[PDB]
Amino acid sequence: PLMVKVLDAVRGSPAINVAMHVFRKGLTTEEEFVEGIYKVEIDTKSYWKALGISPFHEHAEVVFTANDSGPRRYTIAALLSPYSYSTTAVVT
Amino acid sequence: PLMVKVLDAVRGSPAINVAMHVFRKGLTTEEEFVEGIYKVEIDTKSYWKALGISPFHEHAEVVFTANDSGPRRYTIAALLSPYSYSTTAVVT
Amino acid sequence: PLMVKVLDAVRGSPAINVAMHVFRKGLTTEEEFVEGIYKVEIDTKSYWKALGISPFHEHAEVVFTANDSGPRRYTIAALLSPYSYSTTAVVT
Amino acid sequence: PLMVKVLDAVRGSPAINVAMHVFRKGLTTEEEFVEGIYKVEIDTKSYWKALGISPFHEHAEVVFTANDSGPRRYTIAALLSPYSYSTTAVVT
Amino acid sequence: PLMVKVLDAVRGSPAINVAMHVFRKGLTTEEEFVEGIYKVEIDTKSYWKALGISPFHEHAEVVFTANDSGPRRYTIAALLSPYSYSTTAVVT
Amino acid sequence: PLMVKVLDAVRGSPAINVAMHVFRKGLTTEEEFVEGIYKVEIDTKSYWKALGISPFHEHAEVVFTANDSGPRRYTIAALLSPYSYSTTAVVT
Amino acid sequence: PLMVKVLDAVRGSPAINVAMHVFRKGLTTEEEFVEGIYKVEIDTKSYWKALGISPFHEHAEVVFTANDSGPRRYTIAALLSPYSYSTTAVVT
Amino acid sequence: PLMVKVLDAVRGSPAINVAMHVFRKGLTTEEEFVEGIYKVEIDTKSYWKALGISPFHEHAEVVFTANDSGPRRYTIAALLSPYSYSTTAVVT
Amino acid sequence: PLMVKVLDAVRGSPAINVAMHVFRKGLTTEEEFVEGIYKVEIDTKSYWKALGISPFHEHAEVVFTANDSGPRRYTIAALLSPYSYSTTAVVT
Amino acid sequence: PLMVKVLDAVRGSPAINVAMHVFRKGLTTEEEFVEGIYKVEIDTKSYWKALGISPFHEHAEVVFTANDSGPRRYTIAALLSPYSYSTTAVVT
Amino acid sequence: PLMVKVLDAVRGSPAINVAMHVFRKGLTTEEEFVEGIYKVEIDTKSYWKALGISPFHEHAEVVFTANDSGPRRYTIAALLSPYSYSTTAVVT
């Protein structure tokens, strides 16, 4: 007789992020899983992933170069941070 | 007799994000999963993924170059952050 | 006798995002899954994906170059962030 | 006797996004799935995907160049963020 | 005896987006699936997809160049964000 | 008779992030796992991952160079930090 | 008769991050695990991971160089630190 | 009859981080574990990890060089340190 | 009849980090553990880890050099140190 | 009838870090352990760890050099030291 | 009938670090242990650890040199030392 009670009585004006999971009971294999529920990804980089079976098997001559140079500005305010009765100013 | 009770009584004006999962019970394989419910992806990069079976198997001469240069500005305010009785100001 | 009760009584004017899953029970393989429920993708890049079976199998001479330069401005305010009794100003 | 009760009584003027899934029970394979319920895509790029079986199998000489330069401005306000009794102002 | 109850009593003037799923039970294959329910695509780009079986099989000499330059302005306000008793101004 | 009671009575306007998990009971294999519930990734880099079975098996001559140079500015304020009756100010 | 009681009565406006896990009971193998619930990653780098089975098996001549140079500024304030009745200023 | 009582009565406006785990009962193998719940990663580097089975097995001539030079500034204030009635000021 | 009572009555505005574990009862093997839940890692470096089984087994000629030079400044204030009624100033 | 009572009555505004573990009852093997509850890592270095089984087994000629030179400044104030009614000042 | 009572009544604003463990009852083997509860590691170095079984077994010619030179400044104040009604200045 499992019972879960969440934010039953809310009197007011909150700022809320609620993540709940209820569970009652082949290069890359993933099964029965929970991933990136509130995941935030900024300027992520993946070059070579899961190329495959027997790639470049014989007499491969590869030249791999990755140049991550760049003038980049992101400037996030209040990332994944709920706020209440509050002021968020991004001024440039 | 599983029972889940969430935000049953809300008196007021909140700012809410609610993610709830209730569960009662081949190069890339993924099964019976939940992913990227609130996934936020900004300027993500994937170059080579799952090319396949026996790619470049024999006598391959590849030249892989990735130039991630660039003048880029993102400037997000209140990302994935619910707010109440609040000010979100982006000024440039 | 599974029972789920969410936001049963709402008195007021909230700002709400509600994501709720109730579950009772070959280069890429994907089964019985839930993906990108509230997914946000901004300036995402995928160059080579799942090329296939035996691509460039013999005597391939490839020249792969990716130039991610560029003057780009995004400037999002209140991304995936419900707000109430609130002011969102984007001024340039 | 599964039972789901959502937003049963709403007294007021909320701003609501509701996604609910209730479930009772060959290069790319996807089965019995839910994708992009509230998915948001901005300036996404996919160059080469699922080219096929035995592409460029023998003596291929490819020149792949991708130039993602460009003067681009997006300027979204209140993306996927319901708001109530609120101001959303985009001024340029 | 599955039962789903949503927004049974609404007293007021809300702004609502309602997605509800009730489920009781070939290079690219998708089966019994749900996709792009509220998916939003802006300036998305797909160059080469599912070219086919044995394309460029022998002695192919391809020159692939993609120039994503361009003066482009999008300027969306209140994307996928229902609002109530609210003001949305896009001024240029 | 498991019972979980969280934030049952909330009188006021808090700023809350709630992650709650209730559980009652092949190069890379991941199963029965929960990951990235609130995980945030900024400027993460993965070059070569899960290349495959027997890659570069015989007489491979690879040149791997990764240049992570670049003028980059991130400038996040209030990352994953809910705030109440508060000011979040990013000035440049 | 396990019972868990968390933040039962909250009178006021706190800033809260709460993570709770309830549990009642082949190169890389991880199963039945809960990882990176509130994990934050900034400028992380992984070059070669899980290359595969018998890579560079015979007569490999690799040149691996990683240059992590770069003018980079991050400047985070209030990372994973909820604050209340407080002032967060990032000034440059 | 295990019972856990945490922060039952909170009168005021604290700044709180709460992690609670309640438990009642092959190169890399990890089982039934909880890892990096509130882990913070800044400028972490992993070069070669889990290359695989029999890599560089015979007559390998590798040149591994890692140059971690770089002008980098991080400048975090209030990392994983909730604060109340407080000032967090980053001035440059 | 195990019973745990923590911070039952909190009158005021403290700054709190709460980590509580309640427990009632193959190169690398890791079982039934909790590791680095609130561990924070800054500028950590791991070069070669778990290369694999029989790497460089015969007639290997490796040149391993690691140059950890670099102009780097971190400048953290109030790391993992909650503060109350307090002022945190980082001035450069 | 084990009973644990911690910080039952807190009247005031303290700064608190709380770690409590309550417990009632193959190169690297670790079982049923707790690690890095408040673990802090700064500029840690691990070069060669768990290379594997029979690495460099026969006729290996390795040249291992590690140069930990570098202009590096860390300058942490109030590390893992909660403070109340206090000033934390980093001036350069 | 074991009973533990800690900081039952706290009237004031102390600065507290609380670590309590309550316990009622193959190259490297580690069992049922507790490590690095408040561990702080600064500029720690581990070069060769657990290389493996029979490494450099026959006719190995290794050259191991470790140069720990470097201009490095750490300058921590109030490390793992909670303070109350106190002033912390780090001035350079």
HEC string of J18-63 equals EEEEEEECCCEEEECCEECCCCEEECCEEEEECCCCCCCCECCEEE
| Phi, psi for K51 (deg, rounded to 5) | -55, -50
Q: Per the CB < 8 Å rule, is J82 touching H81?
A: yes
- How close is the nearest chain J Cα to the Cα of K74, in Å? 5
Interface I–K counts its CB contacts (< 8 A) at: 10
CB D28 within 8 A of CB C28: yes
The CB density around residue E3, as the number of other CB atoms within 10 Å, is 12
Interface residue B68 vs chain F (CB under 8 A) = yes
Interface B–D counts its CB contacts (< 8 A) at: 9
C-alpha span between I22 and I32 (Å, rounded): 13
| Phi, psi for C76 (deg, rounded to 5) | -100, 140
Q: Per the CB < 8 Å rule, is D31 touching E30?
A: yes
C-alpha span between J61 and I63 (Å, rounded): 9
C-alpha span between K47 and K40 (Å, rounded): 19
Torsion, Cα of I80, I83, I86, I91 (10° steps) = 10
Instruction: Show the tokens assigned to A73.
Output: 């500005």
- How close is the nearest chain I Cα to the Cα of J7, in Å? 5
- Of the candidates C27, C81, C84, the beta carbon closest to that of A13 is on C84
- How close is the nearest chain B Cα to the Cα of A52, in Å? 5
Interface mutation vs chain A, best among B3, B16, B24, most A CBs within 10 Å? B16
Instruction: Show the tokens assigned to F92.
Output: 């440049």
Helix (H) or strand (E) holding E89: strand E87-91
Strands of the sheet with D15-24, listed across from one edge: E15-24, D15-24, C15-24, B15-24, A15-24, F15-24, G15-24, H15-24, I15-24, J15-24, K15-24
- How close is the nearest chain F Cα to the Cα of B88, in Å? 10
Taking CA atoms, what residue in A is nearest to G85?
A86
Taking CA atoms, what residue in H is nearest to G16?
H16
CA F79 from centroid of its chain's CA atoms: 12
C-alpha span between A18 and A8 (Å, rounded): 13
Q: Per the CB < 8 Å rule, is F82 touching B84?
A: no
The CB density around residue D57, as the number of other CB atoms within 10 Å, is 24
Q: Per the CB < 8 Å rule, is G34 touching H31?
A: no
K and A touching (3 or more beta-carbon pairs closer than 8 Å): no
Taking CA atoms, what residue in G is nearest to A51?
G51
Give the side-chain half-sphere CA count within 13 A for J91: 5
Instruction: Show the tokens assigned to K17.
Output: 């670090």
Cβ neighbours of residue C16 closer than 8 Å, sequence gap 6 or more: B15, B16, B18, C7, C82, D14, D15, D16, D17, D18, D82
SS3 of residue G51 by DSSP: coil
DSSP per residue, K16-58: EEEEEEEEE---EEE-S-EE-SS-EEES-EEEEE---SSTT-B
Kindly list the residues from chain A whose CB atom is less than 8 angstroms away from the CB atom of residue C85. 13
For residue G60, which of G73, G71, G69, G51 has the smallest C-alpha distance?
G51
- Of the candidates A15, A27, A79, the beta carbon closest to that of B79 is on A79
Binding site feature residues of G: 5, 86
C-alpha span between J6 and I4 (Å, rounded): 8
Q: Per the CB < 8 Å rule, is A88 touching B89?
A: yes
Helix (H) and strand (E) counts for chain E?
Answer: 0, 11
- How close is the nearest chain F Cα to the Cα of B49, in Å? 9
Q: Per the CB < 8 Å rule, is D52 touching E53?
A: yes
Burial K16-34 (b: 16+ CB within 10 A, else e): bbbebebeeeeeeeeeeee
Question: Chains meeting F at 3+ CB pairs closer than 8 A?
Answer: A, B, G, H
**Domain containing F27: what range?**
1-92
Instruction: Show the tokens assigned to E72.
Output: 């482009």
For residue E86, which of K80, G42, I7, C83 has the smallest C-alpha distance?
C83
- How close is the nearest chain F Cα to the Cα of G86, in Å? 5
Cβ neighbours of residue K79 closer than 8 Å, sequence gap 6 or more: J76, J79, J80, J81, K40
Cβ neighbours of residue I9 closer than 8 Å, sequence gap 6 or more: H8, H9, J8, J9, J10
CB E37 within 8 A of CB E19: yes
CB H83 within 8 A of CB I15: yes
CA distances from I6 to D8, G6, H5 (A): 36, 10, 6
Q: Per the CB < 8 Å rule, is C70 touching B67?
A: no
- Of the candidates K13, K52, K78, the beta carbon closest to that of I84 is on K13
CB G55 within 8 A of CB H51: yes
Where on the phi/psi map is residue A39: left (φ > 0), alpha (ψ -120 to 50), or beta?
beta
The 3-class secondary structure across chain C, one letter per residue, is CCEEEECCEEECCCEEEEEEEEEECCCEEEECCEECCCCEEECCEEEEECCCCCCCCECCEEEEEEECCCCEECCCECCCCCEECCEEEEEC
Interface mutation vs chain A, best among F53, F68, F69, most A CBs within 10 Å? F53
CB F9 within 8 A of CB A10: no
For residue H82, which of I46, G86, I31 has the smallest C-alpha distance?
G86
C-alpha span between A16 and A80 (Å, rounded): 10
CA H35 from centroid of its chain's CA atoms: 8
Cβ neighbours of residue I3 closer than 8 Å, sequence gap 6 or more: H2, H3, H4, H5, J1, J2, J3, J4
Name the H helices within chain F: none
Q: Check whether B5 is labelled as a binding-site residue.
A: yes
The CB density around residue A27, as the number of other CB atoms within 10 Å, is 24
The CB density around residue K43, as the number of other CB atoms within 10 Å, is 16
- How close is the nearest chain K Cα to the Cα of I37, in Å? 10
- Of the candidates I13, I52, I78, the beta carbon closest to that of G84 is on I13
Q: Per the CB < 8 Å rule, is H91 touching I88?
A: no
SS3 of residue H2 by DSSP: coil
Q: Per the CB < 8 Å rule, is B66 touching C63?
A: no
CB G84 within 8 A of CB G13: yes
Taking CA atoms, what residue in J is nearest to K46?
J46
CA angle G18, G24, G25 (to 5 degrees): 150
C-alpha span between I39 and I37 (Å, rounded): 6
The 3-class secondary structure across chain A, one letter per residue, is CCEEEECCEEECCCEEEEEEEEEECCCEEEECCEECCCCEEECCEEEEECCCCCCCCECCEEEEEEECCCCEECCCECCCCCEECCEEEEEC
Give the side-chain half-sphere CA count within 13 A for D51: 25
Residue D66, beta-bridge partner list: C66, E66
Instruction: Show the tokens assigned to I84.
Output: 């109350």
Q: Which residue type, as a one-letter code, is found at position C6?
A: V
CB H29 within 8 A of CB I29: yes
C-alpha span between D73 and D71 (Å, rounded): 7
- How close is the nearest chain K Cα to the Cα of I46, in Å? 10
For residue K18, which of A33, G89, A55, J37 has the smallest C-alpha distance?
J37
Q: Per the CB < 8 Å rule, is H91 touching I89?
A: yes
Instruction: Determine what percent of chain H falls in helix, strand and coil, rounding each to the nearest 5.
Output: 0, 55, 45
CB A64 within 8 A of CB B63: no
The CB density around residue H92, as the number of other CB atoms within 10 Å, is 15
For residue I37, which of D88, G34, F24, D67 has the smallest C-alpha distance?
G34
CB J17 within 8 A of CB J40: no
Kindly list the residues from chain K whose CB atom is less than 8 angstroms away from the CB atom of residue I81. 78, 82
Instruction: Count up the domains in chain D and report the number.
Output: 1
Which parts of D1-92 are beta strand (E)?
3-6, 9-11, 15-24, 28-31, 34-35, 40-42, 45-49, 61-67, 72-73, 83-84, 87-91
Resolution of the deposited coordinates, in angstroms? 3.0
Instruction: Show the tokens assigned to C42.
Output: 């901004």
CA distances from A55 to A88, B53, B56, F46 (A): 50, 7, 6, 19
Kindly list the residues from chain H whose CB atom is less than 8 angstroms away from the CB atom of residue F12. 13
Kindly list the residues from chain H whose CB atom is less than 8 angstroms away from the CB atom of residue I6. 4-7
CA distances from B52 to A47, A54, C48, E11, E24 (A): 15, 9, 11, 56, 36
Place of tokens 């901005």: D42
Kindly list the residues from chain D whose CB atom is less than 8 angstroms away from the CB atom of residue E24. 24
Cβ neighbours of residue C52 closer than 8 Å, sequence gap 6 or more: B52, C27, D27, D50, D51, D52, D53, D54, D55, E27
C-alpha span between J88 and J83 (Å, rounded): 9
Taking CA atoms, what residue in H is nearest to J89?
H89
E and C touching (3 or more beta-carbon pairs closer than 8 Å): yes
Question: Chains meeting K at 3+ CB pairs closer than 8 A?
Answer: I, J
Taking CA atoms, what residue in B is nearest to A91?
B91
Backbone interruptions in chain G following residues (C to N > 2.5 Å) = 25
Q: Check whether I25 is labelled as a binding-site residue.
A: no
- How close is the nearest chain H Cα to the Cα of F26, in Å? 10
CA distances from E80 to A92, D17, D35, F48 (A): 27, 9, 17, 37
Q: What is the CATH number of the domain that holds B63?
A: 2.60.40.180
SS3 of residue J71 by DSSP: coil
Instruction: Show the tokens assigned to J19.
Output: 């770690």
Interface of G with F in 13-52 (CB under 8 A): 13-52
- How close is the nearest chain J Cα to the Cα of K29, in Å? 5
Interface of H with F in 70-89 (CB under 8 A): 70, 78, 82
I and H touching (3 or more beta-carbon pairs closer than 8 Å): yes
Residue C35, beta-bridge partner list: B35, D35
CB D17 within 8 A of CB B15: no
Q: Which residue type, as a one-letter code, is found at position C5?
A: K
Interface mutation vs chain I, best among H30, H83, H87, most I CBs within 10 Å? H83
Question: Chains meeting C at 3+ CB pairs closer than 8 A?
Answer: A, B, D, E
